[PDB]
Structures are given as structure tokens and as C-alpha cells.
């Protein structure tokens, strides 16, 4: 509409509501340094529009990138890694105090060295002898 072009220059009308190119904003700002300062954040685009943060994470836009803020149970660039799916013997010994046995299909199972037995929590070990291996009695075993 040419009748809309009768209206005087405006950053809100031409650039906010509508789009606007480098020359349109340069005509408004006049200075090169001022137009470059506006254009670097304007022509950058919203990287968070593709909703890249998974599992209920929050997106924060950056210059040609973004940052995902994950909920406590998740991690990764896009919050894709579920912390619950990491219960394997190579990850902090599977939460076991002594031995860890990896089991495919079912979950991992913790075990104990001789002279110890597995506790109720399924991960801790307790001595079944007065002098179990690898404990120092003068420091109260």
C-alpha cells in the first residue's frame, strides 16, 4: 500500500510491527555504528522459535545460538538426556557401595565382598565378621 508510505519514519511502525531491511533502519538511525548496533540483534533471529529445549526446559536466545535451562532430572544442550536412564555400573559404580553387576533387560544389582552382606536399600554393605577386610579398627572400622 503506497498510502502507508505517506507516513513519516518510525522504528516501531517500520521495524517492530513490520519487518524492515538494513537501509530502512539506516535511514532512521543515520549513523553506521548506531545502525550496526541495532541490526546485530535484529537480523539475528529467534533461535528459540524452533522450541529446541525438551522435557520442559526453558530457552534463552543468544547471538546465533541459545541456552536451555533444564529441569533437575534432565541434561544436555537441549535437555534430551534423562538422568534416570543412566543407572549403569560405569556411572559412579551404579550407586553401589562395593560391587556392581550390569543386567540387560532388568536394572543393575549391587553386591558385596566376602565378610559383608547387602543391606535393605539394595546398594549399601554391612560387615558380617568382627574384622572385615579393608577397614581400620583403631579408627572405629
Amino acid at each position: 500500500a503506497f498510502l502507508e508510505e505517506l507516513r513519516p519514519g518510525s522504528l516501531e511502525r517500520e521495524c517492530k510491527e513490520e519487518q524492515c531491511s538494513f537501509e530502512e533502519a539506516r535511514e532512521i538511525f543515520k549513523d553506521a555504528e548506531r545502525t550496526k548496533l541495532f541490526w546485530i540483534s535484529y537480523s539475528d533471529g529467534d533461535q528459540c522459535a524452533s522450541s529446541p529445549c525438551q522435557n520442559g526446559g526453558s530457552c534463552k536466545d543468544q547471538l546465533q545460538s541459545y541456552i536451555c535451562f533444564c529441569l533437575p532430572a534432565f541434561e544436555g544442550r537441549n535437555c534430551e538426556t534423562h538422568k534416570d536412564d543412566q543407572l549403569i555400573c560405569v556411572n559412579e559404580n551404579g550407586g553401589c557401595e562395593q560391587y556392581c553387576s550390569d543386567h540387560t533387560g532388568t536394572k543393575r544389582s549391587c553386591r558385596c565382598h566376602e565378610g559383608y552382606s547387602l543391606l535393605a536399600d539394595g546398594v549399601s554393605c554391612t560387615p558380617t565378621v568382627e574384622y572385615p577386610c579393608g577397614k581400620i579398627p583403631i579408627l572405629e572400622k
Partner: protein
């Protein structure tokens, strides 16, 4: 041990002092009431195989107290692949004639499962090394049990951080590096056979054995220990086998 501290009495309860004809020979580690793990090179020049003594509950070599127990060594088992005068396969499994009694001062160190040792214990940064060995390279030995905390290195890092000075034998898959290259802290001659013990979630385990000690704390070199996880299956099989007439037994490895 160079650069360490005195182990407070009873705080290294698995440490063994090996004597031959009453003389200080090597170190060792008690893994149960009957079996002791030591280094194969310790037995290189032994003539009197019936005169081997293991001492548990020792602390001060100049004073005897009620905490020390002595046992004759009935059998020394070394892998067949070990070649005297060299570094590889430096491990010995000793059978005591009679069991020791476990006390507040005499407690075995856990021998771990291979997998727990390889994927968990191998990534614990610091472990302890101990012995009555030389307090400096070519120096006099210690009268009280000394202990030293040392950081472990993966062999790639160890070789990249070392200088090929003096005797630099290959560091094989049956060895691991631990310590410092600045010449301040290491295990020395006389500490051979002793434990490299790792603390994990309230319990201590055997990870390494003090190998050759001569040349200890050389600037440009780290400490090199027998990688005990490679021998778990071998040690467990031999612990189930019956005794042989001779003291020395070269058993097949693997």
C-alpha cells in the same frame, strides 16, 4: 618411602614385613588369614627357601610389642612368564604355614573383583603406598612404617609426562603409573612388595604392588606398580589349589 609420613600404629593393618634368615627382605599385603601378595623380584636371589618369615602387626623394627605375629612362609607362587632381573609380571602370592589371628592391629586388605577394579578403583585419583624401605635413593631404611599418598596416571599421560632418563623399561598393560616426576615423593628399595591401597566408599582395596625400588624419585620418572586387576582370576585360582612340596612354584599365567 621418600617424602612420606609415619603411618600411625595400627593404621596400615594389612602391611607385611618379609624377612629371610632374620634379615629385612621386602614388603607384602595380607589379603586374608592365610594369603599374602608380594613382588616376584623380591625372591630373585633367595637360596634358603625354608627360612622365609612373614611378620604382621609390625610398626617399629627396633621394639617388639604384643601386637606382632610371625608366620613361616609355606609357599611362594610366581607367574611362569616372570623373568628374574626384569620388570614385567612382578607379583608373588604367598601361603602362610598357619593363619594369623585378626586383631585391631592385623586386618587384611580387600582383594577386589576385576571389573570393580578396572572401571571404578582405577579412577580414584589418590591411593596409599607404604613400607620400611629407603628414606632416599641409596639412603638408609626406615625404623617405623612409612606411608605416602600418590596420584594415579593412565600410561599415555605417564609416558608423555616422563623423560627417557636412566633405566626406562616399557610400561606394559600389567603395570600402572602413580606419583610425581619432580623427585619429591616415591616408594623405594625395601618397599617392594608392599601395598598400593585404594579407598572407595568406606573400604580399602588392593590396586597395586610396589615393584622395583632402586632409582626411586628420579626427576622425570613416576612410580610404576604391578596392576593387580590383571591377576585377580590367577590369584583366586591358585588360592583354591592344594600345596606343592617345594617352596617356590612357578604357576602358568594366564
Amino acid at each position: 618411602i621418600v617424602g612420606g609420613k609415619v603411618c600411625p600404629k595400627g593404621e596400615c593393618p594389612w602391611q607385611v614385613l618379609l624377612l629371610v634368615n632374620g634379615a629385612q627382605l621386602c614388603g607384602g599385603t595380607l589379603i586374608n588369614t592365610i594369603w599374602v601378595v608380594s613382588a616376584a623380584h623380591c625372591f630373585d636371589k633367595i637360596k634358603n627357601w625354608r627360612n622365609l618369615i612373614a611378620v604382621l602387626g609390625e610398626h617399629d623394627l627396633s621394639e617388639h610389642d604384643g601386637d606382632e605375629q610371625s608366620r613361616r612362609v609355606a609357599q611362594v607362587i610366581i607367574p611362569s612368564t616372570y623373568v628374574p632381573g626384569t620388570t614385567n609380571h612382578d607379583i608373588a602370592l604367598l601361603r602362610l604355614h598357619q593363619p594369623v589371628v585378626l586383631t585391631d592391629h592385623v586386618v587384611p586388605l580387600c582383594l577386589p573383583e576385576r571389573t570393580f577394579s578396572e572401571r571404578t578403583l582405577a579412577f580414584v585419583r589418590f591411593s596409599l603406598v607404604s613400607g620400611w624401605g629407603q628414606l632416599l635413593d641409596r639412603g638408609a631404611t626406615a625404623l617405623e612404617l612409612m606411608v605416602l599418598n600418590v596420584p594415579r596416571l593412565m600410561t599415555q599421560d605417564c609416558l608423555q609426562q616422563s623423560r627417557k632418563v636412566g633405566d626406562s623399561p616399557n610400561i606394559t598393560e600389567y603395570m600402572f603409573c602413580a606419583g610425581y616426576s619432580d623427585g619429591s615423593k616415591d616408594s623405594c628399595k625395601g618397599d617392594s612388595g608392599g601395598p598400593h591401597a585404594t579407598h572407595y566408599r568406606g573400604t580399602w582395596y588392593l590396586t597395586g604392588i610396589v615393584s622395583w625400588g632402586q632409582g626411586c624419585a628420579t626427576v622425570g620418572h613416576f612410580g610404576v606398580y604391578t596392576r593387580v586387576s590383571q591377576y585377580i582370576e590367577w590369584l583366586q585360582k591358585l588360592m583354591r589349589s592344594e600345596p606343592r612340596p617345594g617352596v617356590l612354584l612357578r604357576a602358568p599365567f594366564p
